[PDB]
Design a protein around this nucleic acid. Structure first.
Ligand code: MG
Ligand code: MG
Lengths: 358, 362, 358, 362
DNA sequence: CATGTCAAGGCCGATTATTTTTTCCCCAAAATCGCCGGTTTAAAATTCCCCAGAAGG
DNA sequence: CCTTCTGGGGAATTTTAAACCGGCGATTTTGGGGAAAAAATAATCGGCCTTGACA
DNA sequence: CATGTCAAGGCCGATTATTTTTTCCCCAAAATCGCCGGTTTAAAATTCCCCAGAAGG
DNA sequence: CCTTCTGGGGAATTTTAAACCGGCGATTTTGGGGAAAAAATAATCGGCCTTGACA
């Protein structure tokens, strides 16, 4: 099959009026081919034909069943399996036929969705790994909060993912935004959800009362479907692939301060690809309504019996309580920072006098 | 030879009643020349001399080989070579014998032929300069087609010199001139040929399809632009590209294609009127930008910064996004055209399209 | 610069004896270029020149320090970092310069080694994942043993990686091979090693006495360097990428039997790439010396006080012991399979009479 | 014209003492023709007639354009065209005027020229059949070079028709013939040109370097093999390829290159003796298979099934593994040659090389 | 002594089978080209009258 | 002193050569059908090289 | 209501700067080609003697 | 009856035409140097599209 140059030359020659024989002689082409290409508006082209039958055709349904349902993409395993079924072919066929399927595996169809301003705050955790601070190992964890409409990323590094730490980071994110969105999206975790009841979302009483105090509602997604919170997950693959990779830190406060400056610099004002607008100039389009702060900092610790005069001794210091506690046993809760609380039957004692009779 | 009139007179005198021998004695010519020319059926014209043998006939095949394949026309190199091969002649013979072939070879370079009606259309490009459209700089380009015979010029401003703009401007030129010419010749450029090797050219696929659809043949082989720029663009007021093209076409119709040449004294209009352009097809070629685009598994496929969302039926596949020069986008999936999605000519954020599809589906 | 075709044509024409001017006219090339190419044994070529200076050159040492020591390969992070240092360039330079480094990162140089016959048996574990058998979840684990010289892979699926299970699988592999190699290579695990002592390999007393009983020596590799046992690790990436992917099983014995048949079919006789010889025809070139089998199947369970007559009751059945145990408390060890043992002060009682007085 | 002898006699008679008027009266020729031819310095030869005007001179440029660019030589198409353009003549004029150009164009196809000494070497390939070497089948191929002038044939058996075998066999042919010819012409094949487009050819890089190192030029343009196979290979006993090549060269030296042609009556040996081959360079080209190979980070890089181990200095890089046809392997890393690793011609397992390096390093 | 290894997938090349395209051969019909002879046109040559110079009555 | 002859120039006609036109014979070209060969595309089989994954 | 998303890397194209190659113009020198005239060679034509046929003394 | 003239054939020489050789004049070609333009390679900057990763 001659190429486009020869066809254009032939058309030129005939339009010039030359004899077919002279065209054939000069172009080194037969006269009949010249004739064919005279009256042919279609120039030479690859002209792909229809795929014909193949040795693998009768086995293709089984190959598809193995590939999709079972999930097999090893060329030789399927070759061995179908050799027992009468396959009289080689392995390159199987590799070539399977290449598209293995290239397009574990990929479903997904529905893109955007929510309304101030009505979806995605929140997620991440165990970054193991780091050494002051010679002591710690399992550091990112906590990330992304506002759905504005994509206003906020992140904080913590040492534990306890309920108290979760609530503290959530409040920090809220005051960072300036308001509490009505719906907060989370993942299936013990703190957020006690469990499941026949596919019914369940939330812990503590978290429910916390949210009622702060006027938001959890909206945990489908179990085992963590793709739902794509915003926060990709905000976590941005922090990790832009900030942590190459970060030098010595103190946790230093790292958090580095992260917040990095956020305000590039993470909160870089024009988002999908929205095309900087997050900071859409962070003011979300309804806000803040509230004061509260916490439940407590640790189950030693007890002390209160004398009949209302005085009890702790670490050599004298503490006086109301006469109602005289003769009863109380729980003294001292944290590593020196904060001291007193409890009785699980209720915090709000009135305490510290008489420094050392 | 001898006078023909003498031969005819001798024949008549023999037929007059005079003995041949007496004729020979009187005329001082033998009786047998008289006898030979008496039976002459026709007058003795130029003697038939048969291929007088020369002094280089044996080497004629060698010299022809040299000239026609080796290409050597000097009369000294080959003179020495034939001397080595046993040549007993001189130089004038070789010079005279090669002179026809020498002039034939020279004529290959004296290309001073005239283009005949409808034969070829010469096309030229140009960077007009730098202009600002909607606050963005752009290197606008002039595109000038020129009929070889009528000399008329069709000029237009286009942002890009890409293949699609080339095809659209060729269509416009054919419409303006009322038909198509046999051959269309350009300057060596990527949109036409994918390189050349000094005598042969590798034509493009889409360009060749276009050319054979409009019945012309491309030709990239090895001023009007500068005149247009010096006489129209300089000192011209315009704020729109469409208005500028309108003004250029008006100027062309008034005082460019109707400007008589000093030598010929005829305006281009009459020359075009006496021109032969083959008809133009009933419909026009689809010069829409042809671009294959993979559609992500979420349906979001991006084209020139605009991310369109499709349905799950065609997610994960590659589709041909034909973009018409006007701005309309047509998506074809394995030949089966898909519903024309919203094509409002206002670049909008992808989240807006997410919302649009989310509300439309439900 | 003309191409090879033009240069060859020019050489042809001059060898033919043509004038320089005629060559120039016919080829459409200037006479001086023709002259240059007449006497030039070097034909036209790409002729790559030397790379010149670049805006990024003064910053390249810092980029290399970030890439290798810190380990940063994000284009924009380094762009931002070096923009503050006076970089007046774009980002494509940085991406292009960094592409080779990111393509060749986390790759050291490694020394290939082969050991002598019957002197290295690599052994490793793997937690395959979570599977459901009879409606009950189980954390299945591969145990793989590869003989260094023969590459004679053996594998067994287990439900736990306890010390007893480890020893049982090791013995099964040994009897599969027919002999105990002198050196057995393991990984840093609690069962194999109690701990570390200033970079000194330490082994548990139980495992040490076990190996002495079976006449082999542990040869645990460098800590944190699990690359040392490449043979077993790739034997584990062969089982997973050839057998488990697409395996249907309902009972653990069925799965182990499937695996052993698959081994004997393709895993033990497929010609190894490096050695070029089937493992089965080099499995007979390794020294062997087996020994009988032993185990420590015990479970800490309930106790029973022995009466003064030597009889004690368990689950309604009467058991008689030697008079030495009269009046003492013993430990009855009953497994789920009904195996019953008796212990006293940690020592198993070997003499017991079961009087079925039900 | 009139007789020159008459003019000379008249001049002498006037110089003899006879009045011009009396001469005119006697000869029946005017006195003034006599006067004109009396002062003749040289005899009156062919009259100088100046470019007799024809009936198609205005159209001569058009006809030349048609013939030399359009290529149309028919005397009917152009006859009608010139009739349209106002042609008042006939057909014989056009036929005769084109006959020179027609025969010149025809001569482009009557390629019946003789190859002169040393000019071109015609090379041909062949699949000899199927043979078994060391228990493995192989499609051996014959390679036959042929001098255009001397007609001698150099034939050799090679397993592969790859480029390196081609270069080695060309070197052997040049050594056998004692020099190199100007041009070497092959059949269209991948090892020489990367495709052609009917008039132009894209030569290879290594092949061109080789050709310009041995001072010849390739030429792929558009029997001896079959004779060799029918007269030597049929009914031949051999168990080695080297022995077969030795026997073929012996046969060529005895009764193939010394077999007189019936027509010429001369053996090829004398024709070669009277041949001009340009000298051969002092050294030979390196036709070692050029293959770039990435070296894994463990130093194990594989070539044709053999996995060699290198040192950490060159681990992770790509090296050029030049394989000489003999079997030796030379590794070059960015120009700096590396120590020639063990190259025993016995394919050995990779574990053996692991052991070798492990014991050598320590 | 401590030392990383093995396999799978993809790509390239070669071989075989089917389909499409190109090339070659024979018979019949048509068209064009070349050579020779005759005629026509253009160019060249020759001859016929007046002015000037030289020679002879 | 004068007359005649000769030489040169101009115009017209004739002759010769070249070119042009028509007819005949030979050769070449074009169209259609059949068979064989070559080229292009798709399918099939085996081997080699490099990279990746569990660590 | 429940619905996956965002960024980074690589590639392509365009623009700018530096280096290499190619092309063009002017002056001086050298070589080759073409035309005209003269000479030589080959081919063609013509003329000069013997045999045959026809006509006239 | 016979003699003379005419026609045809063969050979040699001469004439004409074509071709060949040498010299002169004109034109074309080649080599070197300088300047300008174009092409190729390397470097630089911005944008777009697709894929991958934490889930
Ligand atoms: Mg492990
Ligand atoms: Mg998560």
């Amino acid at each position: 099959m001659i190429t486009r140059g020869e066809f254009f030359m032939i058309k030129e020659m005939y339009e010039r009026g030359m004899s077919i024989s002279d065209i054939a002689r000069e172009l080194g082409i037969d006269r009949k081919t010249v004739r064919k290409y005279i009256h042919s508006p279609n120039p030479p082209s690859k002209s792909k034909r229809k795929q014909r039958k193949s040795k693998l055709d009768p086995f293709k349904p089984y190959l598809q069943k193995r590939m999709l349902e079972d999930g097999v993409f090893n060329s030789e395993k399927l070759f061995f399996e179908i050799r027992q079924q009468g396959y009289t072919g080689g392995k390159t066929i199987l590799k070539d036929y399977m290449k598209p399927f293995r290239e397009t595996a574990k990929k479903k169809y997904t529905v893109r969705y955007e929510t309304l301003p101030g009505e979806q705050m995605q929140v997620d955790w991440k165990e970054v790994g193991e780091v050494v601070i002051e010679g002591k190992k710690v399992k550091l964890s990112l906590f990330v909060a992304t506002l759905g409409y504005s994509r206003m990323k906020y992140a904080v590094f913590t040492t534990s993912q306890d309920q108290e730490h979760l609530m503290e980071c959530l409040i920090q994110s809220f005051k960072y935004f300036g308001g509490v969105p009505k719906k907060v999206l989370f993942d299936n975790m013990k703190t957020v959800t006690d469990g499941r009841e026949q596919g019914v979302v369940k939330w812990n009483q503590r978290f429910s009362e916390f949210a009622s105090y702060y006027g938001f509602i959890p909206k945990v997604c489908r179990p085992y479907r963590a793709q739902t919170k794509g915003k926060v997950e990709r905000a976590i693959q941005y922090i990790m692939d832009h900030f942590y990779v190459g970060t030098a830190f010595e103190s946790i406060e230093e790292l958090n301060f580095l992260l917040h400056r990095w956020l305000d610099q590039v993470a909160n004002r870089k024009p988002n690809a999908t929205t095309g607008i900087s997050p900071q100039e859409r962070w003011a389009e979300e309804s806000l309504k803040p509230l004061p702060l509260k916490d439940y900092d407590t640790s189950y610790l030693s007890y002390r019996k209160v004398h009949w005069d209302g005085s009890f001794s702790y670490k050599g210091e004298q503490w006086l309580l109301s006469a109602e506690y005289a003769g009863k046993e109380i729980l003294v809760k001292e944290r590593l920072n020196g904060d001291i609380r007193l409890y009785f039957r699980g209720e915090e004692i709000s009135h305490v006098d510290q008489q420094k009779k050392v």
